[PDB]
């Protein structure tokens, strides 16, 4: 058996010159929004918040 440790963030900010690179994403881009959660992928590939 081999043990690992998994570093993981949640709930940050980004600096003032906000940018993008994505071609296809529509709704999210408002600057007034703030993310309060992050999603992970489990062993059985089920996303949890």
């Amino acid at each position: 058996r081999i043990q690992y440790t998994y570093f993981f963030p949640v709930g940050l900010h980004l600096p003032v010159p906000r940018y993008s690179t994505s071609v296809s994403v529509r709704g999210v881009e408002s600057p007034a929004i703030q993310s309060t959660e992050t999603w992970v992928v489990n062993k059985n590939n089920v996303p949890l918040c």
């Binding site: 963030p9 940050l12 900010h13 980004l14 600096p15």
Partner: protein, 49 residues
């Protein structure tokens, strides 16, 4: 707890959960005081950054 403005570019690369890299193998052998200077001092900017 971790500030709102910690940079995301730290998070794609494998590192330590504290803000300073804690690799002591690079330091001098049998030197306890020189090994503490990696962890805690701030006159010495990071061994990573």
């Amino acid at each position: 707890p971790t500030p709102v403005t910690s940079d995301v570019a730290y998070f794609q690369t494998p590192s330590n959960p504290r803000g300073r890299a804690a690799c002591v193998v690079s330091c001098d052998a049998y030197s306890n005081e020189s090994a503490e200077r990696l962890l805690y001092d701030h006159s010495i900017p990071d061994p990573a950054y």
